[PDB]
Design a protein around this ligand. Structure first.
Ligand SMILES: Nc1nc2c(ncn2[C@@H]2O[C@H](COP(=O)(O)OP(=O)(O)O)[C@@H](O)[C@H]2O)c(=O)[nH]1
Ligand code: ALF
Ligand SMILES: [K+]
Ligand SMILES: [Mg+2]
Lengths: 766, 51
């Protein structure tokens, strides 16, 4: 009878097994223990069956050391790195090839005529590049590129598919840009296969703008510079410097961006675009001869200075661009009358030369990263472990689940609270809430008559009306709060000096959802009304012990009121001579008035001890004249306020003296046959309420332990499952700086594997 | 029929548990009457009154 919710769950839980254990045992334990093992061993077979078919498309199985997915290893390493750390602290050490040049140059053309002319939005009229776009190029058949690493199935040779693919990239480009600028560092990941593509990662960084026009947000050019740090602070970056062939080199921006990155040109190759505009204006090949020699290019870029040319139409196909480029370069005086042989100028030579320089840098520098990340992990683990010796290995998934079980365990522990605590806490809390209402609004005005029948009649009518409207509504609220008060203590209270504060955000977050769903039984009040009516209706106290308990607790309530009034009075009247002379204090003129106003009222009560609480205006006038006769002029309102506090002090002392004789007078045996005027009807009123609330608490406790705590437990389970799925809150709640460090350690460990996997793939040559 | 077959078996356990809890308390408070009915109660009075 102490608790019934736990028994119900066990009974039906066994029933479920009795009917379905022959299916549950296989699914719940046998399958799950083998499930993890088969992931390593049997999924291996299905992965290999498809992988081999995919490798045949790659040709990796057919040809040793030659596989189109071999270059995809390089991108996988960077994809983890960008997710692990997209900031300069990690990005600055990641090898890459970047397209750098004046925005007007159309610098991206170096990549458009390879694969991107079909799927990347282009054309003049507006700035196209909005954020760094990385394209993973690989020798292979035509295949729809990955867009934001998302799979696609499109034909790259038909306009209808390509147009939709151009839309997809544009959406990422603009969405990466936030208010205040037109460019964003947030990168876009593309991976395309097709003929003529080289194994390398080329990034089209947003074009630099000398000045921010009114058509662009003010921070455009500063943002591009910060994005330009992808190479300016990256010793592993290869820079393709694009000179806008429409304008002279002395008008360029790229010269300063790269010359401050590598003034020796060791990390860069200079490329020129739109050279054919030289013949749409008065061509000056003598300036081109300086261009090839790098006289006017401070970065002294190394390699052959390739040139890109195009019809300028934004619909020219990749094949059309290649054919146009070859014919123009092989005949134009810009290159035929200067030392720029077309077979070195052609973009396809740049793609090969860029691919050649790409693998040179990657193999040389990649091994340094493996040592760097390993050193990082050891330094992080040493400090992380020393500050958190308890957690040698931690994850945010492990952190959440521990709380999930811990929370459910505590709420169950809350369900283990004995009724003794519930009944005492509910009874004590509820009575204290309504202890003054009865005294001030029911008892004291009823005490103004000497007719005990009216006294009991008056209160009973008020109580029944009060009972119907207030008592069960306050009682449930106390019970609802009382359960939450213990729940919070069970939930988030520390175990002395040991406490995992890392879990407090989730615990309180779970509570708020669980209390919102904690709807107390809407009919609990109806039972209490019947109970309270019966508890009040039965006023028969035939037991001395019932009398003894009721009177002592009534005294405490009255003594509390007496001190409450007395403390208010002392402030109203101030210190007496004992404290005025002891602490060198004095009275305010109001306190002086109150003391004399008190004295006159005390004298009035000294004789008229039975004076009713209500004062006649003649008494108010009499006091005023009695005080005015001593030089004290008092507003009637002061007297009435003084009167109320002093009267209760007078009354309450009388009531306690009545209580003293009620217990003592009846206690003496020979006095029980003396019918004195000591009808302790207040003890009858107090006793019934004490019993009435005690029964109320028991009804609340029964509902508390039978229905409400189970609803609280059920809601917690519903909320915790929502949190289990709510990754963002789990991240937002689990921010303890050790799980985040543990998360970083995991990512570092993964990168070390990914770094070595690619490095291991480099070592396939020997 | 999906809901009825799934949940109906729970009722059988619930009612059986109800009877055992009711019989335990009912029998303990009324050990004399292991089985009682309002028809048996009336007839006993009928004979008792006539006697
Ligand atoms: N004349 C000429 N036009 C080009 C060349 N490369 C690209 N374009 C034109 O520039 C426009 C878009 O090229 P794109 O590489 O996207 O430059 P961006 O949009 O300014 O970054 C298209 O209309 C192309 O025809 C080139 O080498 N010569
Ligand atoms: F014109 Al650009 F990136 F070269 F928008
Ligand atoms: K442009
Ligand atoms: Mg562009």
């Amino acid at each position: 009878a102490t608790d019934r919710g736990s028994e119900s769950d066990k009974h039906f839980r066994k029933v479920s097994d009795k009917e379905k254990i022959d299916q549950l045992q296989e699914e719940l334990l046998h399958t799950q223990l083998k499930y993890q093992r088969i992931l390593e061993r049997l999924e291996k077979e299905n992965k290999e069956l498809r992988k081999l078919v995919l490798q045949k498309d790659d040709k990796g199985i057919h040809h040793r050391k030659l596989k189109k997915s071999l270059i995809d290893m390089y991108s996988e390493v960077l994809d983890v790195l960008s997710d692990y750390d997209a900031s300069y602290n990690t990005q600055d050490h990641l090898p890459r090839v970047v397209v750098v040049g004046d925005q007007s140059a159309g610098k991206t053309s170096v990549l458009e005529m390879i694969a991107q002319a079909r799927i990347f939005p282009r054309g003049s009229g507006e700035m196209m590049t909005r954020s760094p776009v990385k394209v993973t190029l690989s020798e292979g058949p035509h295949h729809v590129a990955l867009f934001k690493d998302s799979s696609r199935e499109f034909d790259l040779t038909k306009e209808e598919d390509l147009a939709a693919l151009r839309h997809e990239i544009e959406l990422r480009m603009r969405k990466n840009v936030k208010e205040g600028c037109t460019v964003s560092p947030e990168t876009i990941s593309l991976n395309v296969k097709g003929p003529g593509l080289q194994r390398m990662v080329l990034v089209d960084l947003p074009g630099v703008i000398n000045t921010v026009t009114s058509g662009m947000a003010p921070d455009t050019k500063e943002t591009i510079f910060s994005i330009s740090k992808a190479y300016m602070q990256n010793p592993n970056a290869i820079i393709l410097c694009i000179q806008d062939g429409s304008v002279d080199a002395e008008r360029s921006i790229v010269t300063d961006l790269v010359s401050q990155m590598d003034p020796h040109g060791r990390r860069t190759i200079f490329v020129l675009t739109k050279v054919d505009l030289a013949e749409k204006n008065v061509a000056s090949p003598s300036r081109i001869q300086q261009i090839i020699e790098g006289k006017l290019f401070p970065m002294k870029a190394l390699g052959y200075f390739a040139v890109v040319t195009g019809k300028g139409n934004s619909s020219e196909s990749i094949e059309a661009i290649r054919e146009y480029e070859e014919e123009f370069f092989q005949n134009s005086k810009l290159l035929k009358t200067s030392m720029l042989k077309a077979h070195q100028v052609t973009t396809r030579n740049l793609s090969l030369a860029v691919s050649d320089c790409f693998w040179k840098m990657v193999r040389e520098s990649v091994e340094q990263q493996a040592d760097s990340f390993k050193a990082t992990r050891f330094n992080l683990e040493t400090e992380w472990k020393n500050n958190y010796p308890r957690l040698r290995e931690l994850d945010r998934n492990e952190l959440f689940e521990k709380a999930k079980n811990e929370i459910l365990d505590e709420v169950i522990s809350l369900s283990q609270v004995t009724p003794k605590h519930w009944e005492e806490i509910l009874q004590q809390s509820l009575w204290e809430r309504v202890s003054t209402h009865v005294i001030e609004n029911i008892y004291l005005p009823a005490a103004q008559t000497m007719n005990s029948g009216t006294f009991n009649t008056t209160v009973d009518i008020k109580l029944k009306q009060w009972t119907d409207k207030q008592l069960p509504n306050k009682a449930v609220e106390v019970a609802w709060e009382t359960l939450q008060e213990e729940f919070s203590r069970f939930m988030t209270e520390p175990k002395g000096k040991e406490h995992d504060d890392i879990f407090d955000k989730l615990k309180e977050a779970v509570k708020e959802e669980s209390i919102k769903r904690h709807k107390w039984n809407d009919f609990a009040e109806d039972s209490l009304r019947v109970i309270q009516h019966n508890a009040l209706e039965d006023r028969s106290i035939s037991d001395k012990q019932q009398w003894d308990a009721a009177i002592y607790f009534m005294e405490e309530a009255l003594q509390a009121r007496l001190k409450d009034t007395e403390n208010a009075i002392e402030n109203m009247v101030g210190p007496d001579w004992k404290k005025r002379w002891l602490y060198w204090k004095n009275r305010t003129q109001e306190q002086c008035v109150h003391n004399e106003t008190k004295n006159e009222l005390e004298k009035m009560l000294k004789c008229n001890e039975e004076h009713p609480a209500y004062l006649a205006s003649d008494e108010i006038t009499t006091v005023r004249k009695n005080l005015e006769s001593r030089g004290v002029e008092v507003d009637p309102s002061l007297i009435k306020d003084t009167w109320h506090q002093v009267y209760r002090r007078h009354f309450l002392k009388t009531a306690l003296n009545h209580c003293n004789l009620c217990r003592r007078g009846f206690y003496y045996y020979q006095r029980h046959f003396v019918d004195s005027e000591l009808e302790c009807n207040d003890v009858v009123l107090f006793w019934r309420i004490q019993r009435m609330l005690a029964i109320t608490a028991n009804t609340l406790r029964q509902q508390l332990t039978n229905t409400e705590v189970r609803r609280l437990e059920k809601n917690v389970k519903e909320v915790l499952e929502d949190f289990a799925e709510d990754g963002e809150k789990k991240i937002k709640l689990l921010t303890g700086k050790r799980v985040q460090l543990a998360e970083d350690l995991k990512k570092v460990r993964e990168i070390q594997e990914k770094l070595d996997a690619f490095i291991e793939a480099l070592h396939q040559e020997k």
